[PDB]
Design a protein around this nucleic acid. Structure first.
Lengths: 735, 100, 716, 249
RNA sequence: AGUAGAAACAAGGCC
RNA sequence: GGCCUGCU
């Protein structure tokens, strides 16, 4: 007899055992080298899906741009980006009519937010493409570098501390004859108008790793800092709009998505009488981002912001204006090998414009030949369409408009449709009195989608009777069925620290028990395995064992020293008291009454040199990138113990010409620590104002010395010493 | 309306002392003019220039209607055509001080 | 008017007033009288506060110039002259230290004698109105208020005047100096009434310059300016434009539904080529175990001593010789490496105490076997351009290979029971709730079912091997290291036992990226002759190292005993994911527990015990030439565990792609079997998407064969 | 005394003087987050990889003067080589366990008073009473429920001023809290935590967690109470219901 | 050789 | 041969 697990589906329905079809127990695919090939392929594919448009050359950037809008209507089922302006404007108008007051309200709240938003909001972001160094750097670092360059060039309106003023300075920089940047190898280099325009309109391309569910790798993009404020405002407007649309599912979580899917299916099927047939289409959109033209987003926003202050319209329109002229950096480059001479070489992507094509294979040779005409200063113009879901929410708005355009008031026919859209994925429930009606409805829905630059993937889509469908790895079969294979990768040690890892693991087990219908015995097994892996990872074994490690000696002496050994934490080699009933309690508090007072005091000592807290945002928040989803943050319950240390940093900056960044880091951190000691609320509430550091610090020294004498340790001798030391630092700052 | 007459100038030794006085017919100033130059600020009433501070003292008697400039530790570089007194628009004719 | 503040007031005050001007964001060129008025307010604040000191008594000491001493305390300490944030900082600090009441508006000074605030304001109008005006602005105030006015008069409540009168004569002399100096200037046409409390501003975000031209090039094809396009949008109204283009659009743009029937789906085509080879990092079906029967636990003990003791338990060693060559390497190197390992093992046996971890010599043998100094040296392009052989890295579709029957048998025997327990679980909090007791009983049942399973043994082998390899790579980055493959089990009798499959030599492991490869050489004992399925051992070199005698009724077999030696490699990501193989247990048993719960939701009672003991219900878990064979729930547990283990062992992008694109077709087939009239828009496209994932991986090809068999058995 | 002294020492050196002079208060946050350290994409892989090194964690410089450089057998506990972009020094994990067996001891009696939420959870569970498990299909319907069982009927911003006035009374600024509920909360949490020396930031964070109301969408069947939602994993399942009554009731 | 698979590893750089 | 780094 030959064993075959798949035959199990002959008795258990597919959805009731779908977890077996998710090989999420092995290493996910990773990219190894350059992503330049993928970037070039994506650029060429985006440009050839809109080949029948019209070509122009921008007078500012001098780059060739392709406009397919209002182009010839498609005559085949292949992907097409020839969106029609009038059709999309009409779709938005019908969306407004079905939801009166949506645009005006959303614009009002967006106007409030834009005129009260601060610059620091831009620091709350992941890697961004700093143009000062032409590389990806943390959002805060890139923002600081750009602000420094602007201030050195004379653009100091951002000193007002307002994001709108920062954007005003950004736009004013566009009209400057010559800017100056700094490079280390420090050298001051001058950038002319066109070079700075291209550096501000460019995107950095990388390869996406840890992407499960496809054989081929893809490319993703990261924009600069000049354009992120406009993107933030536009996405704020789009989120405020989608929050008023029940057909959208992008700005919500997973459980809300499931609830809305259940509600829509029940509404569609229940209202349908015996005569009407119902069919569900589990649709995926092929080349979703490559076929969405930024000009059409400009049209949608300018229709949304009608009868609004002109400044609001301008600030919300700046973003799509820059995306329509966006450029993409090709990537890291290409690495060549010569086996005859036994050597390797790494050529940067910027040489692709001039480098001969003898080194490249046929596929890459043709890709380079096709993309060369669009190469301007080492970057390729990508006007026709978006690169990687930067305007997720606006795309969801367009999809929701398409979905609502079939409310049976615009169809003008017996058939009708509804459903749920989340960018690149949708479920469409279509009802009609007969199979011919369903066919006509789906055909018209597809045709209308093709008029908006949205394509339906026929290969990854199928239609059945309502009651069974899929949506973003959520399988609905007369009710959503748990999978538990999507969350399997999150059952190990997170990698934050000991206490954080313990709390995160127990909380993940608890949550997957609540949401993903994890069984009790399975949860106990998960707890046991997690504890085993945790002890084997942090070298913290039970203590009563003879497992020799680098940490087994101190742990054993602590074990033999303690009297009530049941109170020792698993991190210190103690027994595990966790169970299904204790999954919502931190380890420290669960073992508090069992700890010896000496060990308890040594553990939770504020003066410990290991605990370090930076800001209110990073107290008990851990960023865990979930499998098959975007990066997410979780609140984990933990007590600040000596085990809450933060791990070592990379330390490879020491071998790079960018070595002075570490000295600047140290000096900035010293100044920030001094300010915090002067202003204790610096971390919890970020200080605001327009004065400089030393003014506030010296003046508060004055006052605090005064009052702490009026009652406290200070003495006249010390108070006068502080006053004249303040005068000394004053005259020092004078010179 | 405000006429001004300076007194107390003359030839003096280097490191010597001299008390200028200006009788008047308001804030007051003492200004000086070297042979090869325009006006130089000395003192006003109190504030003194860098070249004369600590050496020179300005004072006034509002009952006598007089402003005084007490010069001490004089240098050859105090020599000027002339130490003029002023009321603020109204300028004295100046008194010669020559230090040597 | 600004010429006055150029002339009279000192720098300190003028820049203080200029920063106060910047504070609330209004411009000085439009209205300057406010600047002069508030700078005079600030000046009176200073001149009233300074020159006033206190000593340990009350009765402030007044000195025209502060002498050098510790006695420089200031009688009145200023509030204004600071930013709003700091003004409120001082307010709150004084309230919290003085125990006084917090005012709602900005004071100007604080004093000790009377322990309270002073809000000085000198207005153009006479005092006896401005005083009570600001008083009714401030609610129930104990802070004393004192104001002057240009005529020279003073006033205050309580008839209180807090310090010397010569200072106030100073104040009013300053005041009339101001007055009859504007007399020379002539400003009272507006000086009395120049500020009326204007607060208004319009936000201006103007598109101009280059950024405007960009806006003119981001419009539809037949538009010339953003102004015109916005005007058109504002004037646009729906007039049935989607219908016109829908009618005009070609009818070939359709989404016709192709019915999906029993005869529609065709079997997935498998690639053809040379048979598929073995990819695992260790032997799974052909492993052999040398044991000692020690009482130590899994992690307890020292590796090298245990390995040597286990190997000394076997007698019959012969001089090794080549049996099956690598067919691409230098087998004599493998032979010499094996003999070197034996020699150095003896060398450890001789000395005093067995080292916890041993380093081996870097001979040419393992230099070749571990791929040392073979990475091409990195150079610059400007120095290597004329080399004809210089080209890209080989980037093409992997070699095509057809499925072989060995993977099927390997999976078959990976789901079979064993004579040992390969899982020793940790401790949990004592169960207190009845649901916890039910969970514990279920867990005990599953552990009894799966512990005696080759899948659990493979899990432990992989976890231990990858953990040791990662730790050695991170610790001994430079020097080759010896690691014996150790796994500890428990017999039926209950006696604990150790097992030594072989050895792993880890090489240079300077791993920077998650994809960087660490090469090692693995040696494992076995009895399976490699002359029967040579195509499964394409990358192995197999020697003959001894003879084994296992008790059998046919005299005694005296079988040969071979050594499978190969060069393999891994990476940080692969090591990390292989050291988390225990979650296969989770996956499998979560699936089984979901089955049990779903069935128990029907009958209102827990159904675990009868499922595991009666074994009445069975699921299709394989096909025999006679037909489909069904097994009890325990066999399903073992089968799913083996499937998860093989997923973790043979993981690859092909597996992910095939899994997704075959789950799609499985859902379609399930819809067909449920009588839900399934339909497809392009089924050929889906088939081509599935078939492109099957290239050379044995596991994915076996999964595809299983899928074809399931289709054949289904659709009936 | 000290604080202004390192201020003067910083201003002594030209670079830090320039940083202090030209940098405005508003930019405080930016430069504080200014770092070359990228946020890790795969934390688990490197935590499993770094812990195999010697000196894998980081600690303040003060550790060099509280913990000896080596333990009894000579295993090093800390190193004097500083981190990449900080003055902290890299140390071994043993320095943690050492601190828990011979490090300085204090009085942790006030931690229960600080971490009110967690200890209240423990007390509620310790006195809970379980019941029989009933096996029947549960119709889990998704609903919006409040998870925090100690929220004082305050929002984030609404309680943020309360938290500042409780911890940072001087940086409150204009705000003086009007609602009398906030008055009593301030009084209680002021007199209760008057000398607690854990950290201002952690105290503020835990006060925010305790007082601020927070809500999330979850699949529930029955219950719906705040105390009954924290144990939602233990009382409700796919095909079983476990009757439970927390200690509070 | 080996790992791996649309491009890489099989140490890097600095003296 | 000596020393530096391992997400920069």
């Amino acid at each position: 007899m030959d064993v075959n697990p798949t035959l199990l589906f002959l008795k258990v329905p597919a959805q009731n055992a779908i977890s077996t079809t998710f090989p999420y127990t092995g290493d996910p695919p990773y990219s190894h080298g350059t992503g330049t090939g993928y970037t070039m392929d994506t650029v060429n594919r985006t440009h050839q899906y809109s080949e029948k448009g019209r070509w122009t050359t921008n007078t500012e950037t001098g780059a060739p741009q392709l406009n397919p809008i209002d182009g010839p209507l498609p005559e085949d089922n292949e992907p097409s980006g020839y969106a029609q302006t009038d059709c999309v404007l009409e779709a938005m108008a019908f969306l407004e009519e079905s939801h009166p007051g949506i645009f005006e309200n959303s614009c009002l709240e967006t106007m409030e937010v834009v005129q009260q938003t601060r610059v620091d909001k831009l620091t709350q972001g992941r890697q961004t493409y700093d143009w000062t160094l032409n590389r990806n750097q943390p959002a805060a670092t890139a923002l600081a570098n750009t602000i420094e360059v602007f201030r050195s060039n004379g653009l100091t309106a951002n000193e007002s501390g307002r994001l709108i003023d920062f954007l005003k300075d950004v736009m004013e920089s566009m009209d400057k004859e010559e800017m100056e940047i700094t490079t280390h190898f420090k050298k001051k280099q001058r950038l002319n108008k066109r070079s700075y325009l291209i550096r501000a309109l460019t995107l950095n391309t990388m390869t996406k790793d840890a992407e499960r569910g496809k054989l081929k790798r893809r490319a993703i993009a990261t924009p600069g800092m000049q354009i992120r404020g406009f993107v933030y405002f536009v996405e704020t407007l789009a989120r405020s709009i989608c929050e008023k649309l029940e057909q959208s599912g992008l700005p919500v979580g997973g459980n809300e998505k499931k609830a809305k899917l259940a509600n829509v299916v029940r509404k569609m099927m229940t209202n349908s009488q015996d005569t009407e047939l119902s069919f569900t289409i589990t649709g995926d959109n092929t080349k979703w981002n490559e076929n969405q033209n930024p000009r059409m987003f400009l049209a949608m926003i300018t229709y949304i912001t009608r009868n609004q202050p002109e400044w609001f319209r301008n600030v919300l329109s700046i973003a799509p204006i820059m995306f329509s002229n966006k450029m993409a950096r090709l990537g890291k480059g290409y690495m060549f090998e010569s086996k005859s001479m036994k050597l390797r070489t790494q050529i940067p992507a910027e040489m692709l414009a001039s480098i001969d094509l003898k080194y490249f294979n046929d596929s890459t040779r043709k890709k380079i030949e096709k993309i060369r005409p669009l190469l301007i200063d080492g970057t390729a113009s990508l006007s026709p369409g978006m690169m990687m879901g930067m305007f997720n929410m606006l795309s969801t708005v367009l999809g929701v408009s398409i979905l609502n355009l079939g409310q049976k008031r615009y169809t003008k026919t017996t058939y009708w449709w509804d459903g749920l859209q989340s960018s690149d994925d949708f479920a469409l429930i279509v009802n009609a009195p007969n199979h011919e009606g369903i066919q006509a409805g789906v055909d018209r829905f597809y045709r209308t989608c093709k008029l908006l630059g949205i394509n339906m993937s026929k290969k990854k889509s199928y239609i059945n009777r309502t009651g069974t469908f899929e949506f973003t790895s959520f399988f609905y079969r007369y009710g959503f069925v748990a999978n538990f294979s999507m969350e399997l990768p999150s059952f190990g040690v997170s990698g934050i620290n000991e206490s954080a890892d313990m709390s995160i693991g127990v909380t993940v087990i608890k949550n997957n028990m609540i949401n993903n219908d994890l069984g009790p015995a399975t949860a106990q097994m998960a707890l046991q395995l997690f504890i085993k892996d945790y002890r084997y990872t942090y070298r913290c074994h039970r203590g009563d064992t003879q497992i020799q490690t680098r940490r087994s000696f101190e742990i054993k002496k602590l074990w033999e020293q303690t009297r009530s050994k049941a109170g020792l934490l698993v991190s210190d080699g103690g027994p595990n008291l966790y169970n299904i009933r204790n999954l919502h309690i931190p380890e420290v508090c669960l073992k508090w009454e069992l700890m010896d007072e000496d060990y308890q005091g040594r553990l939770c000592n504020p003066l410990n040199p290991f605990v370090s807290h930076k800001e209110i945002e990073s107290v008990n928040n851990a960023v865990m990138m979930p499998a098959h989803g975007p990066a997410k943050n979780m609140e984990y319950d933990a007590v600040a113990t000596t085990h809450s240390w933060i791990p070592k940093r990379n330390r490879s900056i020491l071998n790079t010409s960018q070595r002075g960044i570490l000295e600047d880091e140290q000096m900035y951190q010293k100044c920030c620590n001094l300010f915090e000691k002067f202003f204790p609320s610096s971390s919890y509430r970020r200080p605001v104002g327009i004065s400089s550091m030393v003014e506030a610090m010296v003046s508060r020294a004055r006052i605090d010395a005064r009052i702490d004498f009026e009652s406290g340790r200070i003495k006249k001798e010390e108070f006068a010493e502080i006053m004249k030391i303040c005068s000394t630092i004053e005259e020092l700052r004078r010179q | 309306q405000v006429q001004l007459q300076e007194s107390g100038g003359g030839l003096v030794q280097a490191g010597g002392s001299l008390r200028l006085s200006c009788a008047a017919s308001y804030a007051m100033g003492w200004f000086r003019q070297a042979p090869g130059k325009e006006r130089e600020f000395v003192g006003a009433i109190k504030h003194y220039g860098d070249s004369v501070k600590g050496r020179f003292t300005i004072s006034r008697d509002n009952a006598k209607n007089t402003v005084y400039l007490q010069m001490s530790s004089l240098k050859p570089e105090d020599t000027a055509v002339y130490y003029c007194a002023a009321a603020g628009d109204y300028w004295g004719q100046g008194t010669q001080v020559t230090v040597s | 008017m600004e010429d006055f503040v150029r002339q009279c007031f000192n720098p300190m005050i003028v820049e203080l007033a200029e920063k106060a001007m910047k504070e609330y964001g209004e411009d000085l060129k439009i209205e300057t009288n406010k600047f002069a008025a508030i700078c005079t307010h600030l000046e009176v604040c200073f001149m009233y506060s300074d020159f006033h000191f206190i000593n340990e008594r009350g009765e402030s000491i007044i000195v025209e110039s502060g002498d050098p001493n510790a006695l420089l305390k200031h009688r009145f300490e200023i509030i204004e002259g600071r930013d709003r944030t700091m003004a409120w900082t001082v307010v709150n600090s004084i309230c919290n230290t003085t125990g006084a009441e917090k005012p709602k508006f900005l004071p100007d000074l604080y004093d000790y004698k009377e322990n309270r605030f002073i809000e000085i304001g000198v207005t153009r109008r006479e005092v006896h109105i401005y005083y009570l005006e600001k008083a009714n602005k401030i609610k129930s105030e104990k802070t004393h208020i004192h104001i002057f006015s240009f005529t020279g008069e003073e006033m205050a409540t309580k008839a209180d005047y807090t310090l010397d009168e010569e200072s106030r004569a100073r104040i009013k002399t300053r005041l009339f100096t101001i007055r009859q100096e504007m007399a020379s200037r002539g400003l009272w046409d507006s000086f009395r009434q120049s500020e009326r409390g204007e607060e208004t501003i319009e936000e201006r975000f103007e598109i101009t310059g280059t950024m405007r031209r960009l806006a003119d090039q981001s419009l539809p094809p037949n538009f010339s300016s953003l102004e015109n396009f916005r005007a058109y949008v504002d004037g646009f109204e729906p007039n049935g434009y989607i219908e016109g283009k829908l009618s005009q659009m070609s009818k070939e743009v359709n989404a016709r539904i192709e019915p999906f029937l029993k005869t529609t789906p065709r079997p997935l085509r498998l690639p053809d080529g040379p048979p598929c080879s073995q990819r695992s990092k260790f032997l799974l079906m052909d492993a052999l175990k040398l044991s000692i029967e020690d009482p130590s636990h899994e992690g307890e003990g020292i590796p090298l001593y245990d390995a040597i003791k286990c190997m000394r338990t076997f007698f019959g060693w012969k001089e090794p010789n080549v049996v099956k060559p690598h067919e691409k390497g230098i087998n004599p190197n493998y032979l010499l490496a094996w003999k070197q390992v034996l020699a150095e093992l003896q060398d450890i046996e001789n000395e005093e105490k067995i080292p916890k971890t041993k380093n081996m010599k870097k001979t040419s043998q393992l230099k070749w076997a571990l791929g040392e100094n073979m990475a091409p040296e990195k150079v610059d392009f400007d120095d290597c351009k004329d080399v004809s052989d210089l080209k890209q890295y080989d980037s093409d579709e992997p070699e095509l290979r057809s499925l072989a029957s060995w993977i099927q048998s390997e999976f078959n025997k990976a789901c079979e029971l064993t004579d040992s327990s390969w899982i020793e679980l940790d401790e949990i909090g004592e169960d207190v709730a009845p649901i916890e007791h039910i969970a514990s009983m279920r867990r005990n049942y599953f552990t009894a079912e799966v512990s005696h399973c080759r899948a659990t043994e493979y899990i432990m082998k992989g976890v231990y091997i990858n953990t040791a390899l990662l730790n050695a790579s991170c610790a001994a980055m430079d020097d080759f290291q010896l690691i014996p493959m150790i796994s500890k089990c428990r017999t039926k009798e209950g006696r604990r036992k150790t097992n030594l499959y072989g050895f792993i030599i880890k090489g240079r492991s300077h791993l920077r990226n998650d994809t960087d490869v660490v090469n090692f050489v693995s040696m494992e004992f076995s009895l399976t002759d490699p002359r029967l399925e040579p195509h499964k051992w394409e990358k192995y070199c197999v020697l003959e190292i001894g003879d084994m005698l296992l008790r059998s009724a046919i005299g005694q077999v005296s079988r040969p005993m071979f050594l499978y030696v190969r060069t393999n490699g891994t990476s940080k990501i692969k090591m990390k994911w292989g050291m988390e193989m225990r979650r296969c247990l989770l996956q499998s048993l979560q699936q089984i527990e979901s089955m049990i719960e779903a069935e128990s939701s029907v009958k209102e009672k827990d159904m675990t015990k009868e499922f595991f003991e009666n074994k009445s219900e069975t699921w299709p878990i394989g096909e025999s030439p006679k037909g489909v064979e069904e097994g009890s729930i325990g066999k399903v547990c073992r089968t799913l565990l083996a499937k998860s283990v093989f997923n973790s062992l043979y993981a690859s992008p092909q597996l992910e792609g095939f899994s997704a694109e075959s789950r799609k077709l499985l859902l379609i087939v399930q819809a067909l079997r449920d009588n839900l009239e399934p339909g497809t828009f392009d089924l050929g496209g889906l088939y081509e998407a599935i078939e492109e994932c099957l290239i050379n991986d044995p596991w994915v090809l076996l999964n595809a064969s299983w899928f074809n068999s399931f289709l054949t058995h289904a659709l009936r | 005394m000290e604080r202004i002294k390192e201020l003067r020492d910083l201003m002594s050196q030209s670079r830090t003087r320039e940083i202090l002079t030209k940098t405005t208060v508003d930019h405080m946050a930016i430069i504080k987050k200014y770092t070359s350290g990228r946020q890790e994409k795969n934390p688990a892989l490197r935590m499993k990889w770094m812990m195999a090194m010697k000196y894998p964690i980081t600690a303040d410089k003060r550790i060099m003067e509280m913990i000896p450089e080596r333990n009894e057998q000579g295993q090093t506990l800390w190193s004097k080589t500083n981190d990449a972009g900080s003055d902290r020094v890299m140390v071994s994990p043993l320095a943690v366990t050492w601190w828990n067996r011979n490090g300085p001891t204090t009085s942790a009696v006030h931690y229960p008073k600080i971490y009110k939420t967690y200890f209240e959870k423990v007390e509620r569970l310790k006195h809970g009473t379980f019941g029989p498990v009933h096996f029947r299909n549960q119709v889990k319907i998704r609903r919006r429920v409040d998870i925090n069982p100690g929220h004082a009927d305050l929002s984030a911003k609404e309680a943020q001023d309360v938290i500042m006035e409780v911890v940072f009374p001087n940086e409150v600024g204009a705000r003086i809290l009007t609602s009398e509920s906030q008055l009593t909360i301030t009084k209680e949490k002021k007199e209760e935590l008057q000398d607690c020396k854990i950290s201002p930031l952690m105290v503020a964070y835990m006060l925010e967690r305790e007082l601020v109301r927070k809500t999330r969408f979850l699949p529930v069947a029955g219950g719906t109470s705040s105390v009954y939602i924290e144990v939602l994993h233990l009382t409700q399942g796919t095909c079983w219901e476990q009757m439970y009554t927390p200690g509070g009731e």
